[model samples]
Target: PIFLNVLEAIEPGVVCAGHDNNQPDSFAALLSSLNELGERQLVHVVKWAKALPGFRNLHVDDQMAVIQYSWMGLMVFAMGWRSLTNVNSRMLYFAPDLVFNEYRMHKSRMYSQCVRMRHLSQEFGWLQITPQEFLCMKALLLFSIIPVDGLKNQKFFDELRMNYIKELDRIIACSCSRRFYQLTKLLDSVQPIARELHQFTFDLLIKSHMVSVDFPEMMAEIISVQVPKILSGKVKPIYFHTQ
Candidate 1:
C-alpha cells in the first residue's frame, strides 16, 4: 500500500505535446510533435525516477543510464494505458495534445506498431489491470533493459531490480492463480513493441533533416547515443520468456 501510494502520488501529471492541432497532420508535423512530447516527458521521467525508492542507491551514472535506456518503453507503456483510460483504447493518447487515430497512425508511418500498441492497451481493460498492478509493473519495466556490457554499478542495479520484482510479486499475491504469469507475459510483450518504435525513430532521426522531422535536444541526444546500442544489440531488454 505504501509503495502503491508513492507511485500514485509521484506519477507525473498530464503532459501536452504543444502540437498545433489546427494544422494538417503531415508526417513531419506529427513526428516533430511526438519528438517534442518525448522531450517534455523526459523531464518528468527524470524527476519521477529519482523519487523512486532505492533509485539513487545506484551509481549516479547508472541512474542516468537507466532512465535514458528505459524511457521509450516507459513512455510507450504509459501512453498505451492512457489511450485505454482516456479514449477507451480506440486511439493512442500520446498526450493531451497528441492523440493518434487510425489515420494518424498511417501518416506517422508506424501503423503496424500503433496497432500493436493498441492491442497492448486493450489488454489493460480486458485483464482489468488494477491501478496498483499498473504502477508496480510500470516500475518493474524501468529495470527490464540493460546494456550487454553491464552498468557502471551492476550490483546495485541488480539488487534494485530484484527488489522491484519482489514488490510486484507481493502486489499480485492476492490475485488469481495465473495473474502473475499473465502480467509477466504482458510486461515482456512490451519489449517488441518498444523495439519497433526504437528502430522507426532511429531511422527517422537519421533522415530527420530530409524528412523535416525535428527531434528536440535531449531526445536527439538520447536517440543518437543510447538508442543505437539498443538497435545494434549492444543493449537489450530482459524478457521473461524465451525468444
Candidate 2:
C-alpha cells in the first residue's frame, strides 16, 4: 500500500478517456495534444522527484537540476505504461485519442522511436508486470541521472539510486525464479528507449522553433532552455522550488 500511495501521489488519475479522432490530421492540433499530455506528465515527474530520497534535501537549484535532467526519461516511461499493443491490428495507443500506426507517425521523426516503444509494451505485456515492478521501474528512471558536471551531492544520489535498484531486485526475486533475467532485461529495455524518445522530442521542438511555430511554454522552457544548456556544458543550475 505504501508503493501504491507513492504512485497515486505522483499520478493520481486514470488514463484520459476523451479523444477526438477527427483532429489527428492537423499537425498543430497533434502538437497541442502532445503538449497537453507532456505537460500533464511533467507535473507527475516533478512530483516524483520531490518525493525521492535526498531530493528535497538538495539545494533548491540542485532539485531543479534533477527534474530538468530526469523529466524526459520519466515522460517516456509514463507513456510506456499507457501504451496499448494489438499485433493483429498493428495499433499503438498513447491514449484513446492518440493512437497511431507505424506508417502514420513515420513522417514525423518520432516514428522509429515510437515503434521501439510499442515493442517495449509488447514485452511488458508478455512479462505480466506487476504494480510493484512498475513503480520500481519508475523510481529507477527518476534516479538515473545524466552525468552533467557541477551537480552537487553525488554520493547521496548514488546511494539512493542503488537502494531502489536493490529494492527492485527484491521485488522480482520474490515472485520469480528468474529474478536476474527479468530485472536486468526490464532495466536494459527502458533506459535506451527513454533516451531515444527524449532526443526525438527535443529535436521536434527545435524543428518547430526554426519555423517560428509557437511551442508549448513548459516544453519550451525545458527543452529549449534547460536541456540545451545542460547538454552544451553550461551548468548554471536554475534556482526554483515547488510549493
Candidate 3:
C-alpha cells in the first residue's frame, strides 16, 4: 500500500495526468512535453531513493553511490511501464515525436543496445507486466550491487541487498507459482536494458545539447554519473553555425 502510494506520487501513469486542450495522442504535444516529463521523473527518482527506509542510514557517500548506480535502472523500469500502453506492435514511443522504429534504431550508433531495449519493450506487452512487478524490480535493481570502491558500509549494503531480494521473492511467491521462472527472467533481462538506456541517454544528450539547456542541475549530475569516464572527460560543447 505504502510503496504503491510512493510510486504513484512519483509517476502518475502511462497517459499524461495533467494536459491542456492539446490532443494527448498527437506527435507535437508529447514531443513538446517530453523534456519536462523527463526532468520530473529524475526528481522523483531522487525522492524515492531518499525515502527508502535504511538508505539514509548508510554513509552519505554510500547513499549517493547506491542511488547513482541504480537510478537509471529504476528509470528504465518506470519507462517500460509508462510506455506499455503507448507502444504498439511497431514503434517504441518515448514521446509522440520520438517514435523509434526497430529498423532505424538498429542502424544507429547504439544498434545492439537499442535492439535489446526494443526486445524488453515488446516483452513487456507480451507478459502484461503489472505495477507490483515493476516495484519489486526497482527494489532488486537498487540493491543488487557488489562492493564498490567508495562504498563505506559494504557489509551493511550487502545485508540490505539480501533483504530486498527476499522481499522480491516474497512478492513473487504471493503472485503466482508459475511466474517464478518468468519473473526471474524478467528481472535479469531488465538490468542490461537499463544500462543501454543510460548509454543511449548520454549519447542523446551529447548529440542534442539538451544537457546544458533542458536538464536541471540534479539531472545533469545523474547523467554525468551514467556516462562513461572517457566521454565524461572530453565531452565538448557543440555549437551549430547559424547562417
Candidate 4:
C-alpha cells in the first residue's frame, strides 16, 4: 500500500490500480515489494537514475533499458544480498568455485532469455500486459532469487557478459534512427522497475551495516563495453538499391 501510494504520486496516470480495486490484486506484483525495505531501496536508486541529467536525456529505448535493468536486477540482487548477509553465509566460502559455476549457468540462461525476449518486444512492439510480456517479466523477476556475484567469477561471468554485450551491440548496430528512438523510450520505462529494486536492497544492506556496492555499475560496464560496437555512426538514412 505504501508503494501503491508512491506509484500513484509518481505516475498518477497509471490507473491499473485504482483505489477502489485495491483488494489484494495479484496484478500489482511490483507494488507488493514495497513492504520490504530491500526492494524499496532498489526502486529508489532507479528513480535517481531516471532523474539524472544524462539518463533523462538519453533515447527512450536506452531509458527503458535502464528501467528494465533496474527492476529486473533488483530482484536478482536482493536474493544475492540476502544470501550473502545471512549469518550462516560463510558456508559459501567453502565451495565458492562450484557455487560460482552454477551461478553462471543460471545467470547466463536467465539473462539471455530476458535479452532475447526484450529484443522481441522491441522489434515487434509487444504489449507489456500479455503472456509473452509475462514470460519476460518472469525472467526479469527471477533475478530476485539469484545470489549476488553468483556470476562474478572472472572467467565464467565475463564470458557470459561478453556474449550478451556483443549480441546487444549487433542489435544496436542495425538500428535505424527511428528504431533507436523507440528503443530508448522503451528502455526508459523499464528502468524504473530496476531503480526500485536497487534502492530497496541498498537500504536493507545499509541498515545491517553491510558495505553496499551499486551493481548497476556492473551494468554500466557491460553497456560501455558494447556501445562503441553498437553505435558505429551518427544518425543517417539508409537506402537499398540493386547494383
On TM-score, the leading prediction is 1
| Tens-digit per-residue lDDT, 1-243, candidate 4 | 332233234321111111222343221221222223223444554564454323334445545443443344433323332234331322211112112123432432223433332333333334223222222232223122212223223343234334433333344443345544553344344433343334433343344223222223433343334222223322111111111
Per-residue lDDT value at 56 in model 1: 89
Q: Give the TM-score of candidate 3.
A: 0.66
lDDT of 2 at 172: 75
Point out the higher-scoring one by lDDT: 3 or 4. Answer: 3
**Candidate 2: 10-residue stretch with minimal lDDT:** 234-243
Candidate 2 residue lDDT tens string, 41-124? 677667667876555656677677767877766666666666633232355665656766665566344667777777777666
Give stretches of model 2 more than 4 Å off. Answer: 1-5, 15-20, 52-54, 84-89, 107-109, 175-177, 209-213, 229-243
Q: What lDDT would each prediction earn against the true structure?
A: 0.92, 0.63, 0.58, 0.32
Per-model TM-score versus the true fold = 0.97, 0.78, 0.66, 0.24
After superposition, the stretches of candidate 1 with alpha carbons farther than 4 Å from their true spots are 175-177
Q: How much is the lDDT of residue 67 in candidate 1?
A: 92
lDDT of 4 at 232: 31
How many angstroms is residue 39 displaced in model 1 relative to the true structure, after the best TM-score fit?
Answer: 0.3
- The per-residue C-alpha lDDT of model 3 at residue 234 equals 30
* Model 4 lowest lDDT segment of ten: 234-243
Candidate 3 lDDT tens digits, 59-154: 777777666666665666666555566776555555444555665454334457656666776777788767677676676676653332435887
